Scaffold this active site. Structure first.
Site, PDB file in Angstrom:
ATOM      1  N   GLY A   1      31.758  50.536  56.018  1.00 34.08           N
ATOM      2  CA  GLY A   1      30.847  51.385  55.697  1.00 34.08           C
ATOM      3  C   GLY A   1      31.753  52.608  55.333  1.00 34.08           C
ATOM      4  N   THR A   2      32.460  52.796  56.328  1.00 30.76           N
ATOM      5  CA  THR A   2      34.011  54.140  56.200  1.00 30.76           C
ATOM      6  C   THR A   2      34.733  53.282  54.674  1.00 30.76           C
ATOM      7  OG1 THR A   2      34.297  53.583  58.293  1.00 30.76           O
ATOM      8  CG2 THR A   2      33.389  55.747  58.077  1.00 30.76           C
TER       9      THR A   2
ATOM     10  N   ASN B   1      47.186  44.322  64.162  1.00 31.95           N
ATOM     11  CA  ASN B   1      47.886  45.734  63.209  1.00 31.95           C
ATOM     12  C   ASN B   1      49.102  45.898  64.055  1.00 31.95           C
ATOM     13  OD1 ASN B   1      44.718  45.738  63.356  1.00 31.95           O
ATOM     14  ND2 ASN B   1      44.622  47.828  64.148  1.00 31.95           N
TER      15      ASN B   1
ATOM     16  N   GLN C   1      37.865  53.296  61.308  1.00 33.12           N
ATOM     17  CA  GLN C   1      38.247  52.858  62.333  1.00 33.12           C
ATOM     18  C   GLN C   1      39.277  51.377  62.166  1.00 33.12           C
ATOM     19  OE1 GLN C   1      37.609  50.039  65.074  1.00 33.12           O
ATOM     20  NE2 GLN C   1      38.138  51.273  66.393  1.00 33.12           N
TER      21      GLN C   1
ATOM     22  N   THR D   1      31.902  40.052  62.687  1.00 34.72           N
ATOM     23  CA  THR D   1      31.255  40.332  63.853  1.00 34.72           C
ATOM     24  C   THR D   1      30.082  41.251  63.111  1.00 34.72           C
ATOM     25  OG1 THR D   1      31.664  42.466  64.556  1.00 34.72           O
ATOM     26  CG2 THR D   1      32.869  42.273  62.936  1.00 34.72           C
TER      27      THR D   1
ATOM     28  N   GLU E   1      33.229  58.908  62.291  1.00 37.02           N
ATOM     29  CA  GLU E   1      33.155  58.898  63.491  1.00 37.02           C
ATOM     30  C   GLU E   1      34.400  59.292  64.814  1.00 37.02           C
ATOM     31  OE1 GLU E   1      31.717  56.465  67.214  1.00 37.02           O
ATOM     32  OE2 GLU E   1      32.337  54.865  65.815  1.00 37.02           O
TER      33      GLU E   1
ATOM     34  N   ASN F   1      40.997  38.468  58.897  1.00 36.03           N
ATOM     35  CA  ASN F   1      41.143  38.415  60.522  1.00 36.03           C
ATOM     36  C   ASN F   1      41.719  37.056  60.693  1.00 36.03           C
ATOM     37  OD1 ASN F   1      39.569  41.393  60.491  1.00 36.03           O
ATOM     38  ND2 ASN F   1      41.121  40.921  61.039  1.00 36.03           N
TER      39      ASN F   1
ATOM     40  N   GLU G   1      57.966  47.898  40.942  1.00 37.53           N
ATOM     41  CA  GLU G   1      58.669  46.476  40.518  1.00 37.53           C
ATOM     42  C   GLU G   1      57.259  45.349  40.151  1.00 37.53           C
ATOM     43  OE1 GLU G   1      62.132  45.335  39.271  1.00 37.53           O
ATOM     44  OE2 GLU G   1      62.441  47.737  39.511  1.00 37.53           O
TER      45      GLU G   1
HETATM   46  N1  LIG Z   1      42.798  44.112  61.421  1.00 38.30           N
HETATM   47  C1  LIG Z   1      42.219  44.707  61.922  1.00 38.30           C
HETATM   48  N2  LIG Z   1      40.946  44.574  61.743  1.00 38.30           N
HETATM   49  C2  LIG Z   1      39.993  45.555  62.519  1.00 38.30           C
HETATM   50  C3  LIG Z   1      40.298  46.215  63.311  1.00 38.30           C
HETATM   51  N3  LIG Z   1      39.287  47.241  63.686  1.00 38.30           N
HETATM   52  C4  LIG Z   1      37.932  46.420  63.143  1.00 38.30           C
HETATM   53  N4  LIG Z   1      38.518  45.467  61.895  1.00 38.30           N
HETATM   54  C5  LIG Z   1      37.750  44.754  61.360  1.00 38.30           C
HETATM   55  O1  LIG Z   1      36.838  46.105  60.431  1.00 38.30           O
HETATM   56  C6  LIG Z   1      35.910  45.058  60.062  1.00 38.30           C
HETATM   57  C7  LIG Z   1      34.414  45.889  60.523  1.00 38.30           C
HETATM   58  O2  LIG Z   1      34.270  46.947  59.515  1.00 38.30           O
HETATM   59  P1  LIG Z   1      35.442  48.135  60.287  1.00 38.30           P
HETATM   60  O3  LIG Z   1      36.463  48.760  59.462  1.00 38.30           O
HETATM   61  O4  LIG Z   1      34.523  48.400  61.888  1.00 38.30           O
HETATM   62  O5  LIG Z   1      33.958  49.450  59.790  1.00 38.30           O
HETATM   63  P2  LIG Z   1      34.819  50.775  59.924  1.00 38.30           P
HETATM   64  O6  LIG Z   1      35.840  50.995  59.348  1.00 38.30           O
HETATM   65  O7  LIG Z   1      34.828  51.611  61.650  1.00 38.30           O
HETATM   66  O8  LIG Z   1      33.279  52.206  58.907  1.00 38.30           O
HETATM   67  P3  LIG Z   1      32.573  52.489  59.900  1.00 38.30           P
HETATM   68  O9  LIG Z   1      32.054  51.131  61.560  1.00 38.30           O
HETATM   69  O10 LIG Z   1      31.003  52.566  59.290  1.00 38.30           O
HETATM   70  O11 LIG Z   1      32.426  53.238  60.838  1.00 38.30           O
HETATM   71  C8  LIG Z   1      35.877  43.612  60.868  1.00 38.30           C
HETATM   72  O12 LIG Z   1      36.572  43.157  59.252  1.00 38.30           O
HETATM   73  C9  LIG Z   1      36.508  43.788  61.864  1.00 38.30           C
HETATM   74  O13 LIG Z   1      37.066  42.664  61.981  1.00 38.30           O
HETATM   75  C10 LIG Z   1      41.544  46.307  63.757  1.00 38.30           C
HETATM   76  O14 LIG Z   1      41.478  46.951  64.630  1.00 38.30           O
HETATM   77  N5  LIG Z   1      42.643  45.787  63.062  1.00 38.30           N
END
Ligand SMILES: Nc1nc2c(ncn2[C@@H]2O[C@H](COP(=O)(O)OP(=O)(O)OP(=O)(O)O)[C@@H](O)[C@H]2O)c(=O)[nH]1
Ligand SMILES: Nc1nc2c(ncn2[C@@H]2O[C@H](COP(=O)(O)OP(=O)(O)OP(=O)(O)O)[C@@H](O)[C@H]2O)c(=O)[nH]1
Ligand SMILES: Nc1nc2c(ncn2[C@@H]2O[C@H](COP(=O)(O)OP(=O)(O)O)[C@@H](O)[C@H]2O)c(=O)[nH]1
Lengths: 170, 426, 43, 60, 62, 430, 411
Positions: free
Chosen positions: G118-119, G202, G10, G153, G45, G180, G228
């Site tokens: 997780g992913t 982002n 995500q 989070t 997802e 973050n 490099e």
């Molecule tokens: N910079 C940034 N960080 C994000 C964003 N969305 C989620 N995160 C970070 O992602 C982490 C939480 O894990 P996720 O990325 O949500 O997990 P995932 O990749 O969705 O894997 P699953 O939720 O299990 O399907 C935390 O550190 C959040 O702050 C985003 O849009 N930008």
């Protein structure tokens, strides 16, 4: 008042070196938080959950972690001449107790020698740190010295002047 | 920016504050329904001191109403600008004190002030950097005196490093409504000397004579007295809400006006105050404002400063004026009447200017004088208290509720040392 | 000055001379160091 | 107590910083001294090269 | 709040480490430079001492 | 040749709102910051990007309102937003609160803004600070900021133009305490410090500017003229120029005597301008009469040590030198014996300009005099009387002691100022 | 000269939603390195992927490239590594192969993931493993999001972070840390957005990525390719975790007033108040720095600025590296996005350095992980998904080895 202090330092230095080695239990120069609990057990006092961490934290200020003999003399001297410094004294007390110990249960009348060296003070001021009386002796241990010293330092620290100030009358 | 929550206690406190929020809302351009309709940006930029935007232009006052009878609370929501207060801020008992200071301080206080404190705590954390608290109450009643008194003590224990104002009317022998006024006054003041940061002494005699001679009113109902008091309270805080050439916050005035920590009871006046027959015949100048300001009859307390000497004095001016006139007027009124000012403090008058007048007037003023004549009031009530206490009249509702004999003796002693230390410092 | 003090020295019924002794013990070392400086000073 | 421990530690750290700054001044000017002084050595070196040169001329 | 104060103090102590570290390096470098100062002075002095000798023998021979 | 200007407190940054308006108008810079060689502006403005000018100044204060009007004022664009520093609560005429309670956390941010302003400069001449010693913000963190500047730079000049509390015209009550505790650092931290009374400026504008009801705006206006007159030598070329490191050497005969009486000429109204011609002879006279000084004190009670004379406009060295000779041979004013020549003159070509709405007429030529004398010693004694008068019963000391002070600095600072009295007195004696 | 970019999870594909918006806007032959895009979004997802399918860029992306699973990983490394990853990972890499087949001069892959999920943790590590087997020699640029100390989070994110980093050592060649909480503080301090969302984060991450690949897309005075960083910044095979920073991150109001030049932005890129990782580089000693310059910059002042840095003493360098810099200059100015909160600048600098402050982050994470693991809290979820009790302790000891490595090299 300098002569009392200089003469005291001249004699306590040799006692201090052995006090250090004796506190160490690993036959090294470093004093770990582990050793401190063993020392308190020898004194017959028990630490609280976080006391040892604070004890190790406050003393050391040139590196982080375990303490070293160099830090220990720096602490000793700063605390000794600390008087109007409002400075920490958590681990000074345990070492001063061990050095001022020669009976292996605590010391009785020697508090006065400690007191006079710090200041001539007063018999009433003595009735402040503890309840010892001139004629009577007592039994003492590690438990009753550290707690009272620590509480006294907290008691002095609290008092400050806000609306407690008092000016000469008109 | 800096925020002041408002606390109104008892019937006198509630009605005083109702007119206060009406006058203030008119200054900032909020209609009785609670929406913004002003024009200048200077009105929208400083409403965070007294209000909170709720949703869609809804500005609610940052006030807390507190008393023991339902009649007062209902009388607030009935009148206009009654629908602007948040209903959760109506902390409220039911039984009543009955002009019994013990019932307001020991019996009924124990079950209400905790609830009052929850609302007050919520209003303090709702803002960022508190400037202080603002309490309006009486000294002769029970639910205003005792209830507000214990509230003040608890608050100073929670937020000690914050300012605090108490606008309090005091009883006097000529205007005597309750019979136990001295018992309430001396005990209430005994708490104010060690809790409040600074108190503003008010009384009903001065209010009656202002509406008799200056205002020349025929039927001065309580709405006009509350109208007068509200103008003074708005004046003390105009510096926080509007920029000016010489700003003076609450802390600036208190640290400058209070030379000794227990001597913090003030006498107040307000200018201009003119009748409708003479509102046309007057001018608007700084000296014309100053003499009507320092007038003895124009004090909003019935304690004539010309019976004693001024310790310190303060002036809060509002409107486009020239600061030279401000400073030279304070210097002249101190040089001619030189004996009326204390000697071991030069320049006993602090002055400040704000560039926004009250709506409808070109130029106004507000006087805050810390004189030494106030000891008359303390003796005037002290002898009445001692006269009653030396035969234990009206005592069984006091001693049967929790007070002992030493409390009244403590009250006399603190009363007597304050009038004695006023006498020394004068 | 020590041997003009009101308390009896042989009595343990007073037990207040224990501050006089630790004041005597500092000026004894003061005499020691004064004489040491005198020796160091005449050579 | 901690609010004042912090002030003593800050004082100690500044006492070191003003020391570090002074140490850089010593480093810099000493480097300058080497440049001027080695020039002096070259001048004396030049003097002797010319010196033993004219001696041999006189000998022959 | 105590924890916040604790972290600020730890930071100043950590900042001290690098400063005192660079100070030790600077003493070493200044020591190396000043030792070279003494060695170069001696070498320059030897040339001067040699110079007066050569000039004296030349004059004496004449 | 860059100098940065810092304004401390309400009175401080109010003086700045006059100065920068005046400065941009001199160099033809619009209020939005862009100009619709010519490097003269460089000493105050750095050229950012393309066609944009940013002042070399920071405003700072512990109270939000006085700084905020500037942010939303006409000059929203001129100043970079970060420069305008603000606090969250005022020091409230409390030197201790400004030196120990709120200064301690605002001044660190101040210096790390000052750091990159100095870094952007190349040939930094010095600093100039604007504060009134009567208040708390100007006094407390003022003295604190000076101490930290002395340990940061030390060798660089720090021109401090301070406003003292006037004897009679006053707005506060505890300003005696504020002045003594602030002076105790104004001695050994400021290099060159100019006093500016309030009664003097009020009395000048009542007599000469014939404004019977003057506010703070006109006061600030004429202060900008004085400051502009001693920076004109950096900005524009002249026949005889003097820089900011010349006061250091020529006006301070002792390391604890740097307190200068400022005066300006000609303060003449628009209509009288037509009627009187303003040549160099009459204006050199006008620069010495006490009816045109910036501090209400009488230099006739004292003897001059050294004087400096800024001349602006079409002034040739011939007649100004002749006039200085004429002044020294007169005897209504006198000089210290050991100093035979008591003057340092300077001429610069640009005339002082007018701002719209201002009350200063357009003049051919103007003079700004900065002298040093012993009448300054009378002010300190006059101040000592009413400071001690209130302190003898410990009035108002409870606020300062509760805010973090004690009895040591009252006694020790009071006696230090007493020592300063002796210094002025001993130098006067032959 | 082509580089393909995969986006996992995500967080990865939301970052990608900003990256590709910037790329297509920037290119309106130089576009050949990116352009259909050379990307595969993949997630377990389908809600965030179908946001791309119904968005504005419905036509830009080829339909198959958008990979979407059927069920979530439930914030479990084990679930996203052994249960559900096993079905999606094979389809993902079967696509990466023929995208690389279409390419000719492939520089490397670059991956975007967050290690707290997780992913991003589970199948992100799994995908990197199989890519190392298939290619090996090609550079893999890993831009990870480690969890912050105080801003969080999730709850079990220590478990995922340790378990992900264990494979992140020997799989990615270049690894850039981005927290973050640090970026929140950046957007609050310099960009003065008091209420930031993920979109702003982002957006400026994409600005950093574009700045370090601009050397390929456009010719500069001193070009610096993807190989490099591989050489000039990684002194040892197990130390590859790089602090990132960018300058000037300035709002529109402030930027015009400020005079942007090379010396001050080179300074601004070295203060800890402008880094993308909440860490104190003063606590550490620098090993090697890399400076990317874009816009109007001549080689003189970049060399002058680097000289002033090396002579200052609030920041110290390692003894084993006297010449600790690798600069790079490119002509093209940084582009802007309409709606983006950054103003146009003449010149920008992206710093990518390596220090021992990162060694402090891993100890801080280890303590939190250690506390929960001892009493086996939350362990039973992962064990049910297919893992065991052994791999938690063995991953713990792997981080312990890394802590010792940083303390020894810094000596
Ligand atoms: N910079 C940034 N960080 C994000 C964003 N969305 C989620 N995160 C970070 O992602 C982490 C939480 O894990 P996720 O990325 O949500 O997990 P995932 O990749 O969705 O894997 P699953 O939720 O299990 O399907 C935390 O550190 C959040 O702050 C985003 O849009 N930008
Ligand atoms: N010349 C001049 N003096 C001013 C001006 N405004 C205020 N003052 C002086 O400032 C003194 C009081 O200090 P202020 O500047 O008003 O306030 P402060 O110095 O910031 O201290 P605080 O009130 O605590 O913030 C008074 O004696 C005034 O004479 C002004 O515009 N011009
Ligand atoms: N100004 C003003 N004073 C009032 C009003 N109502 C009552 N008072 C005063 O309040 C005093 C009696 O106090 P009371 O109202 O019983 O106080 P409470 O019972 O505590 O709310 C009298 O001395 C009145 O002068 C009012 O509407 N306006």
């Amino acid at each position: 008042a300098a002569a009392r202090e200089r003469y005291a330092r001249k004699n306590e230095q040799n006692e201090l070196e052995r006090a250090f080695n004796t506190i160490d239990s690993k036959g090294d120069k470093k004093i770990d938080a582990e050793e401190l609990t063993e020392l308190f057990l020898r004194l017959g006092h028990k630490p609280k959950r976080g006391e040892v961490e604070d004890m190790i934290w406050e003393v050391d200020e040139d590196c982080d972690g375990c303490i070293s003999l160099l830090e220990f003399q720096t602490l000793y001297t700063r605390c000794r001449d600390d008087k109007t410094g409002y400075e920490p004294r958590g681990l000074f007390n345990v070492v001063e107790f061990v050095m001022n110990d020669k009976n292996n249960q605590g010391f009785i009348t020697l508090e006065e020698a400690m007191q006079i060296m710090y200041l001539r003070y007063g018999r009433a001021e003595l009735d402040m740190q503890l309840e010892q009386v001139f004629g009577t002796a007592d039994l003492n241990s590690g438990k009753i010295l550290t707690l009272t010293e620590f509480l006294h330092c907290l008691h002095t620290n609290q008092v400050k002047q806000l609306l407690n100030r008092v000016t000469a009358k008109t | 920016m800096r925020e002041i929550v408002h606390i109104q206690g008892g019937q006198c406190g509630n009605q005083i504050g109702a007119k206060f929020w009406e006058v203030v809302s008119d200054e900032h351009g909020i209609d009785p329904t609670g929406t913004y309709h002003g024009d200048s940006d200077l009105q929208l930029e400083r409403i965070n001191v007294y209000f909170n935007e709720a949703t869609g232009g809804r500005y609610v006052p940052r006030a807390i109403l507190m008393d023991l009878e339902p009649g007062t609370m209902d009388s607030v929501r009935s009148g206009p600008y009654g629908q602007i207060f948040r209903p959760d801020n109506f902390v409220f008992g039911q039984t009543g004190a009955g002009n019994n200071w013990a019932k307001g301080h020991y019996t009924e206080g124990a079950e209400l002030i905790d609830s009052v404190l929850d609302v007050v705590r919520k209003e303090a954390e709702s803002c960022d950097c508190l400037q202080g608290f603002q309490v309006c109450h009486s000294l002769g009643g029970g639910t205003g005196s005792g209830m507000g008194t214990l509230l003040i003590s608890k608050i100073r224990e929670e937020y000690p490093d914050r300012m605090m104002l108490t606008f309090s009317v005091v009883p006097s022998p000529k205007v005597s409504d309750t019979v136990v006024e001295p018992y309430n006054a001396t005990l209430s003041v005994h708490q104010l000397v060690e809790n409040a940061d600074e108190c503003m002494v008010l009384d009903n005699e001065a209010l009656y004579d202002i509406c008799f001679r200056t205002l020349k009113l025929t039927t001065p109902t309580f709405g006009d007295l509350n109208h007068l008091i509200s103008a003074v309270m708005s004046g003390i805080t105009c510096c926080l809400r509007f920029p000016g050439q010489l700003n003076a916050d609450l802390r600036k005035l208190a640290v400058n006006l209070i030379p000794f920590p227990r001597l913090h009871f003030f006498m107040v006046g307000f200018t201009p105050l003119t009748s409708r027959g003479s509102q046309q015949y007057r001018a608007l100048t700084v000296p014309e404002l100053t003499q009507q300001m320092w007038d003895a009859k124009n004090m909003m307390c019935a304690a004539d400063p010309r019976h004693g000497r001024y310790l310190t004095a303060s002036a809060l001016f509002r409107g486009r004026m020239s600061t030279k006139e401000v400073d030279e007027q304070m210097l002249n009124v101190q040089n001619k009447n030189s004996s009326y000012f204390v000697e071991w403090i030069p320049n006993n008058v602090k002055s400040s200017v704000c560039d926004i007048p009250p709506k409808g007037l070109k130029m106004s003023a507000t006087f805050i004088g810390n004189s030494t004549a106030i000891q008359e009031m303390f003796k005037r009530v002290s002898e009445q208290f001692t006269a009653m206490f030396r035969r234990k009249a009206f005592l069984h509702w006091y001693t049967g509720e929790g007070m002992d004999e030493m409390e009244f003796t403590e009250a006399e002693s603190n009363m007597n040392d304050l009038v004695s230390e006023y006498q020394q410092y004068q | 000055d020590v041997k003009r003090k009101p308390y009896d020295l042989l009595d343990y019924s007073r037990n207040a001379f224990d501050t006089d002794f630790l004041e005597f013990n500092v000026q004894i070392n003061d005499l020691e160091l004064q004489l040491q400086g005198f020796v160091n000073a005449s050579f | 107590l901690y609010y004042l421990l912090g002030e003593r530690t800050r004082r100690e750290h500044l006492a070191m910083d003003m020391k570090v700054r002074a140490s850089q001044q010593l480093k810099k000017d000493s480097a300058d001294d080497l440049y001027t002084l080695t020039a002096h050595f070259n001048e004396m070196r030049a003097a002797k090269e010319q010196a033993e040169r004219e001696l041999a001329r006189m000998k022959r | 709040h105590n924890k916040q104060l604790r972290e600020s103090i730890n930071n100043l102590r950590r900042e001290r480490i690098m400063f005192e570290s660079i100070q030790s390096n600077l003493e070493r470098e200044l020591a190396k430079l000043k030792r070279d100062m003494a060695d170069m002075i001696q070498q320059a002095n030897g040339a001067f001492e040699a110079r007066e000798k050569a000039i004296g023998e030349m004059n004496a021979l004449k | 040749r860059e100098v940065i200007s810092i304004h401390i407190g309400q009175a401080g940054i109010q003086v700045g709102n006059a100065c920068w308006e005046l400065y941009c108008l001199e160099h033809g810079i619009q209020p939005d910051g862009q100009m619709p060689g010519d490097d003269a502006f460089n000493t105050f403005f750095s050229e950012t990007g393309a066609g944009k000018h940013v002042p070399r100044c920071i405003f700072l204060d512990l109270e939000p309102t006085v700084v905020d009007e500037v942010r939303t004022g006409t000059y929203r664009q001129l100043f970079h937003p970060e420069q305008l520093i603000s606090g969250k609560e005022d020091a409230a005429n409390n030197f201790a609160r400004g030196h120990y309670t709120i200064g301690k956390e605002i001044v660190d941010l101040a210096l790390d803004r000052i750091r990159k302003l100095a870094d952007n400069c190349t040939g930094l001449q010095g600093f100039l600070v604007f504060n009134a010693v009567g208040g708390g913000t100007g006094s407390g963190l003022g003295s604190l900021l000076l101490e930290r500047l002395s340990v940061d730079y030390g060798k660089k000049s720090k021109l401090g133009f301070t406003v003292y509390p006037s004897p009679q015209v006053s707005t506060a009550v505890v300003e005696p305490y504020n002045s003594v505790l602030s002076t105790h650092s104004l001695l050994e931290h400021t290099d060159v410090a100019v006093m500016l009374d309030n009664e003097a400026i009020y009395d000048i504008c009542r007599r000469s500017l014939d404004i019977e009801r003057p506010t703070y705006t006109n006061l600030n206006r004429l202060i900008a003229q004085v400051i502009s007159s001693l920076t004109a030598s950096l900005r524009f070329d002249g026949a005889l120029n003097v820089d900011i490191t010349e006061f250091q050497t020529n006006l301070v005969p002792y390391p604890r005597i740097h307190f200068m009486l400022s005066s300006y000429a000609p303060i003449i109204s628009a209509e009288k301008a037509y009627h009187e011609q303003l040549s160099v002879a009459e204006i050199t006279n006008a620069a010495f009469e006490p009816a045109s000084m910036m501090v209400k004190c009488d230099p006739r009670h004292g003897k001059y040590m050294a004087c400096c004379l800024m001349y602006r406009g079409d002034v040739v060295p011939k007649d100004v030198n002749a006039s200085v000779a004429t002044i020294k041979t007169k005897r209504t004013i006198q000089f210290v014996d050991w100093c035979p020549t008591g003057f340092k003159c300077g001429i610069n070509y640009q005339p002082p300009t007018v701002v719209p709405g201002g009350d200063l007429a357009k003049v051919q030529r103007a003079v700004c005099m900065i002298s040093n004398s012993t009448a300054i010693g009378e002010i300190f004694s006059r101040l000592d009387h009413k400071f001690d008068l209130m302190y003898a019963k410990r009035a108002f000391v409870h606020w300062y002691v509760g805010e973090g002070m004690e009895e040591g600095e009252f006694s020790e600072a009071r006696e230090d100022l007493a020592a300063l009295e002796k210094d002025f007195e001993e130098v006067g004696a032959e």
